[PDB]
Amino acid sequence: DQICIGYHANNSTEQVDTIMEKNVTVTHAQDILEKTHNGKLCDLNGVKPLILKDCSVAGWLLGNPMCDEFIRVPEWSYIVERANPANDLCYPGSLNDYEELKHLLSRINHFEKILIIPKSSWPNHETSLGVSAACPYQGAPSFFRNVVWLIKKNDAYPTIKISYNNTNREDLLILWGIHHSNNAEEQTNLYKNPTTYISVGTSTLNQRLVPKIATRSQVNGQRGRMDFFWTILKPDDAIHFESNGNFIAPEYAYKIVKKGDSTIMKSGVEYGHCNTKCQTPVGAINSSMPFHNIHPLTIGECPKYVKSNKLVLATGLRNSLFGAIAGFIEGGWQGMVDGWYGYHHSNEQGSGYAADKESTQKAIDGVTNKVNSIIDKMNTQFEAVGREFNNLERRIENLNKKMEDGFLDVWTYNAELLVLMENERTLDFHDSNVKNLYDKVRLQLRDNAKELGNGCFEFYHKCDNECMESVRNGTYDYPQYSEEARLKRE
Amino acid sequence: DQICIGYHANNSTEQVDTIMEKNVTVTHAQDILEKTHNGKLCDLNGVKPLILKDCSVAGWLLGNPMCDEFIRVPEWSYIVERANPANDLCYPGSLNDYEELKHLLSRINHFEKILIIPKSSWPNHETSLGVSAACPYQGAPSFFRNVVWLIKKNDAYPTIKISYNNTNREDLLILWGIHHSNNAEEQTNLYKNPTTYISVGTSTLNQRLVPKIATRSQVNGQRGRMDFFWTILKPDDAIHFESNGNFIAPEYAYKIVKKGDSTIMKSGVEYGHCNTKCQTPVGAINSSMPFHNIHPLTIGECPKYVKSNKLVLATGLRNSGLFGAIAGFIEGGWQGMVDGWYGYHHSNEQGSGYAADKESTQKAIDGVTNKVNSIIDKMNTQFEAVGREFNNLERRIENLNKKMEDGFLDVWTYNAELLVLMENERTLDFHDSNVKNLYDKVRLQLRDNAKELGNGCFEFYHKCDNECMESVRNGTYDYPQYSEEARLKRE
Amino acid sequence: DQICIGYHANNSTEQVDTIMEKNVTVTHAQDILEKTHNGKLCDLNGVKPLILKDCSVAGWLLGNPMCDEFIRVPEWSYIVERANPANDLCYPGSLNDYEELKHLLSRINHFEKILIIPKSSWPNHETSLGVSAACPYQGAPSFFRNVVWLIKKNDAYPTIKISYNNTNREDLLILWGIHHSNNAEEQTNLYKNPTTYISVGTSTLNQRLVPKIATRSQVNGQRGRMDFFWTILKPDDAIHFESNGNFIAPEYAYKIVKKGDSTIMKSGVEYGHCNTKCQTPVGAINSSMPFHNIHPLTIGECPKYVKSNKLVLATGLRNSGLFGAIAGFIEGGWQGMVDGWYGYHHSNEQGSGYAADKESTQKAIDGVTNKVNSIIDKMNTQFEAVGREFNNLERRIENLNKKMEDGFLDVWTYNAELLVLMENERTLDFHDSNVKNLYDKVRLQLRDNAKELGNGCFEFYHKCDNECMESVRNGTYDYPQYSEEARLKRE
Ligand SMILES: CC(=O)N[C@@H]1[C@@H](O[C@@H]2O[C@@H](C)[C@@H](O)[C@@H](O)[C@@H]2O)[C@H](O[C@@H]2O[C@H](CO)[C@H](O)[C@H](O[C@]3(C(=O)O)C[C@H](O)[C@@H](NC(C)=O)[C@H]([C@H](O)[C@H](O)CO)O3)[C@H]2O)[C@@H](CO)O[C@H]1O
Ligand SMILES: CC(=O)N[C@@H]1[C@@H](O[C@@H]2O[C@@H](C)[C@@H](O)[C@@H](O)[C@@H]2O)[C@H](O[C@@H]2O[C@H](CO)[C@H](O)[C@H](O[C@]3(C(=O)O)C[C@H](O)[C@@H](NC(C)=O)[C@H]([C@H](O)[C@H](O)CO)O3)[C@H]2O)[C@@H](CO)O[C@H]1O
Ligand SMILES: CC(=O)N[C@@H]1[C@@H](O[C@@H]2O[C@@H](C)[C@@H](O)[C@@H](O)[C@@H]2O)[C@H](O[C@@H]2O[C@H](CO)[C@H](O)[C@H](O[C@]3(C(=O)O)C[C@H](O)[C@@H](NC(C)=O)[C@H]([C@H](O)[C@H](O)CO)O3)[C@H]2O)[C@@H](CO)O[C@H]1O
Ligand SMILES: *[C@@H]1O[C@H](CO)[C@@H](O[C@@H]2O[C@H](CO)[C@@H](O)[C@H](O)[C@H]2NC(C)=O)[C@H](O)[C@H]1NC(C)=O
Ligand SMILES: *[C@@H]1O[C@H](CO)[C@@H](O[C@@H]2O[C@H](CO)[C@@H](O)[C@H](O)[C@H]2NC(C)=O)[C@H](O)[C@H]1NC(C)=O
Ligand SMILES: *[C@@H]1O[C@H](CO)[C@@H](O[C@@H]2O[C@H](CO)[C@@H](O)[C@H](O)[C@H]2NC(C)=O)[C@H](O)[C@H]1NC(C)=O
Ligand SMILES: *[C@@H]1O[C@H](CO)[C@@H](O)[C@H](O)[C@H]1NC(C)=O
Ligand SMILES: *[C@@H]1O[C@H](CO)[C@@H](O)[C@H](O)[C@H]1NC(C)=O
Ligand SMILES: *[C@@H]1O[C@H](CO)[C@@H](O)[C@H](O)[C@H]1NC(C)=O
Ligand SMILES: *[C@@H]1O[C@H](CO)[C@@H](O)[C@H](O)[C@H]1NC(C)=O
Ligand SMILES: *[C@@H]1O[C@H](CO)[C@@H](O)[C@H](O)[C@H]1NC(C)=O
Ligand SMILES: *[C@@H]1O[C@H](CO)[C@@H](O)[C@H](O)[C@H]1NC(C)=O
Ligand SMILES: *[C@@H]1O[C@H](CO)[C@@H](O)[C@H](O)[C@H]1NC(C)=O
């Protein structure tokens, strides 16, 4: 002789945060943040990266004799470099526009080394005495591999005139250099002429260099210096050289065969023989969630980065404002396993739990729609990129550093605020549905039943399981049971 | 004998989107996105722009013999330049700090050309014979028109000392240059002196230049090069020149008569003899909408730019919820309902007809109207993109500039879309509650004198004419006077 | 017989704004925007700042004879410098990499000046004739105090070879310079040799300089120029000099003893004897509010800067979707009620008095405060502006810097105003729901023993005293015990 309505409860212990409350327990939830990595360096889509162990970019390109296992390299997906490489320019000096060169290296996937000037093209100079103790090889003085140090022969240094014509179909990378001597006497011992120069000219290049003879402090046990330069040669251009002395000549060059997407990564983790689709300087990520907090700089197809600790979305009602879930209904039911809103009946034939599948489905579609919307709306988000600056560009370096942290905080704020508000609306949405269900039954049985305070109703007239289906379907005939009602209400 | 409550509906098919639902049909809506353009270039508030057809900025300042239609130029509003101009420095070379000069040129709206150093000032050098085949004019050798190339006369090149003292009350722009020779023999053929120099000095400038002699590849048929420099002279300063050879001397200069706001646009569209108030590289914009999606770079008064495809607001009821009235115990709207969003249908014995609830429609009208205005005002301040240029060796800075401007357009696009989704959700429920409140207001006044059907209508126990049913819509329904009569019929 | 329902009211006149409506009057509201400053410069945390009165950073480091008040300085917290320092570089010239030096100075809190090259280490050269009328001192020619201008003694200028080794366990700052003559004749008078050079070399430095001789315009009273350079010498490193003319030798250097956080401020305000925790160029702020609108650039712990004019958070309900309770079906509030926000008034035969409801006012107060704290917590991290300087030929980079920090301020301003406007709308709803939810509880329990009247209160046909009728606030009522006589009470 009773019909009652309620909601479904379970053993869940998930907890979400709203604007006005924290640690609220819900029946069903799913996390959307990734916090784990494998702690290794692994292949990107089946292509091994290029790992420069203890060499800088300059040491590899100029051919530092100490680390020369990189004489020939296959294709690479990205470049890995340590924080402070040990083997760099061995003879003290510098490389002009070092940072601008490394920006070019981030868009190249393959190099090919070719020989452009054989050593036989220096008949009137000495090509075998350019060794130095600052660049040792197996305990003996040596020098760089891709360049030649020319000194006088038979007490003379005739002027040099040479040219190269690019006949390939790709661009070339060329490097040369100049030497700064110590004193006037040392200048004549190496190159006979007392005043020297170097001039280089292409279709867009025009240069002249003069040595600086002065006194400097010892670096690696030497007081001399060497400066290096580079350029890109077009497929049908030519380059011309001319010098009197202090010249470091090119021997080998690089062809740019494949152009693509890559990065230079600073890390110290070991190679681990894997395959993956997302890589970070601290490890690899394998997940399908839309957010992660591992590291700001990544390569590949990755989830977006936020500086958060947790991000949980609620997909169920409050576990056990229209005042229905908390009030008029003390708590949920464990017996109603199937649905989310349902009925409980008390009858002479028996009792049981029944669920309203129609209203249950409407809620599932409504919330699943919302969840897929949050993933979509955050598709476009700031992606960090690495840039480098030298010691006299501190102003620009600071400007770059603040711009990237500025966007990181904006998107972290947006993600955290969005989760908080949608966790609140979901809980109100579930509450409203149960309130509307209560009214639907109430309007049908206008006077044939009385309210019992809680969700239950007690019937004036006697009925069996049949008209239980009538009320829940809405097919309750008020005039049919109009009699047997006034008699009870005596 | 019977009264009922309902809401207004029509035949519109406009659709909007909320956070929880998509393709929801509404009675009324509003669009806030502009997606059309003229496809032409027009005057900005009545000032014609300056079109450099196949001529670069450098080819216009230094007078390239081909770009001779720009000798005299009136006032302009903005400058239009093609992507890859054909006519540029004809003789091979470069212009120092080209990008910084273009940044300065974006704040100037008029110029005037004056003759600072007449050609009679050089009586011991050859003013003619400075032509070349790299700069042709009507099939004959020529040279830049705003500078002069000086060559030896009578096998001698005396040293030059000259000065100019600004007295025009406005700033001046001056250009000069140096020539690099091919070989040693060429140097003596033209200038007669083996070693040369150029020195220029002002209150803030101290410069010395030396030619470089080397072998270079052919460009435009010539292996020589020419480099040019520029400076700005304050209203009462002076400039001093001294040279031994290889000197390209100034002849004309520009006065900065007018200053203001301008820009340089890269486009290929054609002039349309029209007028406008907003201009984009792809066309002009006529609209009053808050947002647009034509192009990120604009000039003039313009709506804000977003990278979206549709933005529709909702200002009406859902057409055929949280408060369970619009689609709950009220099944649907009334087609015959006009003159009001919410109202009552009356069906007494004297007659039957519809009616409208005044002062319930009006509050909803005022409520939604203020919501729209607040959204427009809150988005007045938005990031505006501006063009900048960098050379081949500034790739790191150029990359940094591009990422900054794309980052801000992503943020503001996210803000605009989120606001529209949320306010649409509130508006739908705002209409839902107002119907529910009206339904409850009648139920309390009526009390037990009527029996509620359960569909949104009430059936009167006591017979009541249009006068007392008008009193229900007054809210002056007098329960006691009809209370006793309804009793007897109740049984 | 009567027990009505109502809500608390007072005489407040605070106003808040929502999305739907502006100037809503509420009982209690907070303010979270600070708008006052003292207008003086104070000590940051008990450390007085360094105030350069009429000098520049260059004038202080290279001792300008006028700026002799700053010969020895104590530890500072930040540096104050006027807009256009009058005393700067008495002898016309320039300082190389000026802006990069100032950026380095922003992370230093203390210097110590030491002597490295005594005057006695210059025999065979003249050390007392290097004075000029451009640096006047007490109306008699003088020169910078940290460098020496060397002139020929007898009629010769022997070459110089000097070296210094850093053995101080701390980094050093060293300055030197070169002099550009006016004429060949003037060159021989000061230094006998006609062709000169300067060579400087460290572990990471390799430089060579040559004078430029030309005619220039008069700045101050002189046509000569001087160029100065600087470097940082790491511990256990040496610097080597060599020249034969036009050399401005170092005499004093600065040690870097304390590193930390500092800044350089462009202000014209005056020093007042006070200490603070936040400092702006306009004044000092002393408050606990979350936001402020004084100035973008600050130092110390400070509220976040926004560009708004008013940020008021509503905390109490309005004073005399929308659940119909507060403004409808309950006309106005109660002035007499003071104990809580919501409560029950009663009128028994014995007397009439107001009462209060706990567990309801408690949850409303608990809810509102949690919302306020979460707003403040969510704004913990926000963009903070820093100062940077660029010279005259870096206009593109300077414009880029301005647009970036302007864009971030508009983004964070938008978030603050949007967050407030939405929570104001939600809060006024929250009180409305509580009023109606209470009304359901009382109506539900008195199912038929009471006759609802529609004004918010119930009339019991039945009679019982304060022990029972008031016993309904506790939530305990026995329907059966009073059902019989209520049923027997019929007409
Ligand atoms: C105290 C003293 O004078 N000692 C002499 C040695 O010089 C000392 O040791 C070297 C390592 C430096 O630290 C010196 O500063 C120091 O005083 C001297 O060794 C030779 O000194 C000369 C000085 O100019 C030079 O450094 C020599 O360098 C070589 C080298 O690297 O070993 C020799 C190479 O063959 C040569 N390569 C050529 C010719 O292409 C170069 C070249 O000389 C310079 O690099 C040019 O800049 O490097 C160094 O060996 C010793 C003689 O063996 O005599 C000691 O009395
Ligand atoms: C050597 C050969 O096979 N051909 C000779 C011509 O040179 C060839 O054609 C020219 C266009 C270039 O491509 C050369 O590289 C090529 O070998 C030669 O023509 C003259 O060549 C000289 C080379 O220096 C020079 O280019 C002359 O060009 C002019 C010019 O630009 O038009 C002539 C002008 O009158 C002169 N102007 C002044 C102020 O004197 C300029 C100027 O001297 C230079 O630009 C300075 O850098 O040069 C070109 O006519 C031909 C005649 O000698 O002989 C062919 O055998
Ligand atoms: C009309 C005329 O010719 N007047 C001569 C004076 O020059 C005039 O006034 C000076 C201030 C300048 O404005 C000149 O451009 C102007 O014509 C001349 O005064 C001296 O002129 C010389 C050369 O032009 C030089 O500036 C002198 O400057 C001094 C100074 O400041 O007083 C003199 C110092 O002793 C000297 N210091 C050293 C270390 O030598 C420097 C000087 O600048 C150095 O030579 C470095 O450049 O400063 C200036 O007094 C006057 C001399 O008798 O003759 C007038 O006929
Ligand atoms: C580099 O080699 C190219 C390629 O052969 C040469 O330029 C050629 O010049 C000849 C002369 O008429 C012509 O075949 C073409 O103008 C060029 N060749 C091609 C295939 O286009 C020249 O030797 C060098 N070019 C430069 C610019 O130095
Ligand atoms: C440019 O000429 C003007 C006008 O002669 C110079 O300005 C001053 O003019 C007054 C007026 O007689 C005189 O004191 C001098 O002729 C000038 N004095 C000064 C201090 O400049 C100006 O000198 C000239 N420009 C320069 C820098 O030489
Ligand atoms: C500055 O002087 C110090 C102390 O004399 C020098 O350091 C010594 O250098 C020599 C030669 O390299 C070594 O044998 C000593 O062991 C060093 N002593 C110490 C305490 O480091 C230093 O080299 C000098 N500076 C320079 C760059 O010449
Ligand atoms: C929420 O619950 C977790 C789990 O114990 C706890 O660590 C955290 O402090 C709680 N937060 C609050 C505000 O109680
Ligand atoms: C990623 O994780 C999934 C789930 O365990 C697994 O099936 C897949 O093999 C993993 N891929 C890699 C490359 O580790
Ligand atoms: C909404 O309507 C658009 C346009 O008619 C259609 O392309 C889209 O698939 C619809 N979305 C859904 C969820 O039906
Ligand atoms: C711009 O649009 C309006 C209508 O929006 C139209 O009346 C007007 O003629 C158009 N052209 C100009 C120049 O305003
Ligand atoms: C309706 O109410 C108004 C009071 O606002 C009154 O003036 C008017 O006479 C009423 N109409 C009828 C028919 O009673
Ligand atoms: C709200 O009231 C203030 C106080 O007088 C007034 O300045 C402001 O204009 C009012 N705003 C509106 C929208 O009425
Ligand atoms: C700021 O104001 C408070 C409260 O009036 C006061 O106690 C405090 O001393 C003030 N701070 C300073 C630095 O004067």
DSSP secondary structure letters along C316-372 = SPBP----TTTTSSS---BSS--S-SEEEEEE-SS-EEE---TTTHHHHHHHHHHHH
Domain covering B2-35+289-490, topology: Hemagglutinin Ectodomain; Chain B (3.90.20)
Domain covering A2-35+289-473, topology: Hemagglutinin Ectodomain; Chain B (3.90.20)
Distance CA A216, CA A224 (A): 8
Q: How would you classify the pairing of strands A449-451 and A24-26?
A: unpaired
Distance CA B392, CA B398 (A): 10
Closest C-alpha among A193, A222, A197 to residue A212? A197
B200, β-bridge pairs: B207, B241
Q: Are A439 and C404 in contact (CB under 8 A)?
A: no
Amino acid, single-letter form, for residue A324: A
Tokens read off for A445 = 């049985």
Q: How would you classify the pairing of strands C225-233 and C93-95?
A: parallel
Phi, psi torsion values for C288, nearest 5 degrees:
-120, 5
According to DSSP, residue B203 is labeled: S
Nearest ligand, measured from the Cα of A278? 8
Distance CA C290, CA C152 (A): 67
Distance CA B405, CA A458 (A): 68
Closest C-alpha among B75, B403, B81, B46 to residue B263? B81
Closest C-alpha among B416, B351, B408, B347 to residue B383? B408
The finding on whether A234 has its CB within 6 A of some atom of ligand 4 is no
Which residues from chain C sit within 8 angstroms of residue B388, using beta carbons?
A: 396, 399-400
DSSP H helices, B81-237, are 98-105, 184-190
Distance CA B404, CA A403 (A): 8
Collapsed DSSP state (helix, strand, coil) of residue A194 = coil
Distance CA A114, CA A117 (A): 10
Length of chain C: 491
Query: Which of A216, A399, A453 lies at the smallest CB-CB distance from C401?
Result: A399
Alpha carbon of C40 to those of A472, B418, C43, C284: distances in Å? 76, 44, 10, 6
For atom 1 of ligand 11, the residue with the nearest CA is B474
By C-alpha distance, the chain B residue nearest C453 is B444
The Cβ of residue B242 has, within 10 Å, a number of other Cβ atoms equal to 19
Which residues from chain C sit within 8 angstroms of residue A422, using beta carbons?
A: none
- Alpha carbon C376 to its chain centroid, in Å, reads 17
Amino acid, single-letter form, for residue A326: A
Closest C-alpha among C293, C261, C298 to residue C278? C298
Length of chain B: 491
Tokens read off for C380 = 């913990």
Provide the sign of the torsion angle of the four alpha carbons B254, B256, B258, B260, taken in this order. Answer: positive
B199, β-bridge pairs: B208, B242
The finding on whether B236 has its CB within 6 A of some atom of ligand 5 is yes
Provide the sign of the torsion angle of the four alpha carbons A275, A276, A277, A281, taken in this order. Answer: negative
Query: Which residues are near ligand 13 (CB < 6 Å)?
Result: C 276, 286
By C-alpha distance, the chain A residue nearest C401 is A399
Provide the sign of the torsion angle of the four alpha carbons C267, C272, C273, C275, taken in this order. Answer: negative
Distance CA C249, CA C175 (A): 8
- Counting one residue from chain A and one from chain B, the pairs whose CB atoms sit within 8 A come to 93
For atom 6 of ligand 10, the residue with the nearest CA is B286
Mutate to test the pocket of ligand 6, among A217, A219, A220, A222 (most ligand atoms within 8 A of CB): A217
Tokens read off for C164 = 């210094």
| Partners of chain B (3+ Cβ pairs below 8 A) | A, C
Tokens read off for B120 = 């009679």
Collapsed DSSP state (helix, strand, coil) of residue A101 = helix
Tokens read off for B459 = 């059936």
H/E element, A451: strand A449-451
**Cα angle for residues B35, B41, B43 (degrees, 5° grid):** 110
| CATH 3.90.20.10 boundaries in chain B | 2-35+289-490
B179 CA → ligand 2 middle, Å: 15
Distance CA A176, CA A232 (A): 12
Torsion from C-alpha of C481, C483, C487, C488, nearest 10 degrees? 0
Mutate to test the interface with B, among A96, A99, A100, A426 (most CBs of B within 10 A): A100
B286 CA → ligand 10 middle, Å: 6
Torsion from C-alpha of C393, C395, C400, C402, nearest 10 degrees? 120
Listed in order, strand segments (DSSP E) in A244-374 are: 247-250, 252-259, 264-266, 271-276, 278-280, 283-284, 291-292, 299-300, 304-305, 312-314, 341-346, 351-355
DSSP H helices, C57-210, are 57-61, 98-105, 184-190
Closest C-alpha among B17, B62, B12, B149 to residue B422? B17
Distance CA C19, CA C426 (A): 10
Give one word for C99, left, alpha or beta, with left for phi > 0 and alpha for psi -120 to 50: alpha
| b (16+ CB within 10 A) / e for B117-126 | beeeebeebe
H/E element, B444: helix B395-446
Tokens read off for C4 = 């009505």
Domain covering A49-269, topology: Hemagglutinin (Ha1 Chain); Chain: A; domain 1 (3.90.209)
Q: Are A160 and A186 in contact (CB under 8 A)?
A: no
CATH code for residues C2-34+306-488: 3.90.20.10
Nearest ligand, measured from the Cα of C15? 12
Amino acid, single-letter form, for residue A91: Y
A395 CA → ligand 10 middle, Å: 49
Give one word for B292, left, alpha or beta, with left for phi > 0 and alpha for psi -120 to 50: beta
Terminal CA-to-CA distance of chain B, rounded, Å?
A: 18
Q: What contacts A141, CB < 8 A, 6 or more positions away?
A: A131, A132, A133, A135
Distance CA B342, CA B334 (A): 10
Describe chain B by its helix, strand, coil percentages, rounded to 5: 25, 30, 45
Tokens read off for C396 = 């593109």
Closest C-alpha among B17, B12, B15 to residue B27? B12
Which residues from chain A sit within 8 angstroms of residue C242, using beta carbons?
A: 214-215
A2, β-bridge pairs: A346, A458
Distance CA C95, CA C105 (A): 15
Alpha carbon of C1 to those of B250, B365, C356: distances in Å? 106, 42, 18
Alpha carbon of C313 to those of A431, A465, C268, C319: distances in Å? 28, 56, 36, 15
B206, β-bridge pairs: B201
| b (16+ CB within 10 A) / e for B390-425 | eeeebebbeebbebbbebbbbbbbbbbbebbbbbbb
Mutate to test the interface with C, among A212, A215, A452 (most CBs of C within 10 A): A215
Atom of ligand 2 minimally distant from the CA of B181: 47
Distance CA A146, CA A62 (A): 6
Query: Which of C214, C329, C397 lies at the smallest CB-CB distance from B199?
Result: C214
Which residues from chain B sit within 8 angstroms of residue C403, using beta carbons?
A: 383, 386, 404
Terminal CA-to-CA distance of chain C, rounded, Å?
A: 18
Distance CA A419, CA A427 (A): 13
B93, β-bridge pairs: B226
The Cβ of residue A391 has, within 10 Å, a number of other Cβ atoms equal to 9
| b (16+ CB within 10 A) / e for C81-119 | beeebebbbbbbbebeeeebbbbebbebbebeeeebbee
- Alpha carbon C72 to its chain centroid, in Å, reads 30
Distance CA C44, CA C51 (A): 13
According to DSSP, residue C258 is labeled: E
A138, β-bridge pairs: none
DSSP H helices, A329-461, are 357-377, 394-444
Atom of ligand 13 minimally distant from the CA of C274: 13
Torsion from C-alpha of A29, A34, A35, A36, nearest 10 degrees? 120
Distance CA A302, CA A133 (A): 48
Terminal CA-to-CA distance of chain A, rounded, Å?
A: 18
The Cβ of residue A316 has, within 10 Å, a number of other Cβ atoms equal to 23
B336 CA → ligand 11 middle, Å: 26
C104 CA → ligand 7 middle, Å: 45
Distance CA C103, CA C99 (A): 6
| CATH 3.90.20.10 boundaries in chain C | 2-34+306-488
Distance CA B183, CA A429 (A): 87
Q: Are C350 and C325 in contact (CB under 8 A)?
A: no
Domain covering B48-270, topology: Hemagglutinin (Ha1 Chain); Chain: A; domain 1 (3.90.209)
| CATH 3.90.209.20 boundaries in chain C | 49-269
The finding on whether A453 has its CB within 6 A of some atom of ligand 1 is no
By C-alpha distance, the chain A residue nearest B218 is A203
Distance CA C326, CA C335 (A): 15
Q: How near does any CA of chain C get to the CA of B99, in Å?
A: 9
The Cβ of residue B436 has, within 10 Å, a number of other Cβ atoms equal to 23
Closest C-alpha among B9, B109, B3 to residue B334? B9
For atom 13 of ligand 12, the residue with the nearest CA is C22
Distance CA C57, CA B14 (A): 67
By C-alpha distance, the chain B residue nearest A242 is B214
Distance CA B12, CA A387 (A): 55
Distance CA A365, CA A387 (A): 46
Which residues from chain C sit within 8 angstroms of residue B378, using beta carbons?
A: 414, 417-418
H/E element, B487: helix B479-490
The Cβ of residue C161 has, within 10 Å, a number of other Cβ atoms equal to 11
Burial of B157 (0-12, 13-18, 19+ CB in 10 A): buried
Nearest ligand, measured from the Cα of A237? 4
Strand-by-strand arrangement of the C264-266 sheet: C50-51, C79-81, C264-266
Atom of ligand 10 minimally distant from the CA of B276: 13
Q: What contacts B161, CB < 8 A, 6 or more positions away?
A: B240, B241, B242, C215
**Cα angle for residues A162, A168, A174 (degrees, 5° grid):** 50
Q: Are A18 and A418 in contact (CB under 8 A)?
A: no
Phi, psi torsion values for B60, nearest 5 degrees:
-90, -40
B47 CA → ligand 10 middle, Å: 18
Question: How many angstroms is the resolution?
Answer: 2.6
Q: How near does any CA of chain C get to the CA of A323, in Å?
A: 6
H/E element, C173: strand C172-180
Collapsed DSSP state (helix, strand, coil) of residue C150 = coil
A34, β-bridge pairs: A292
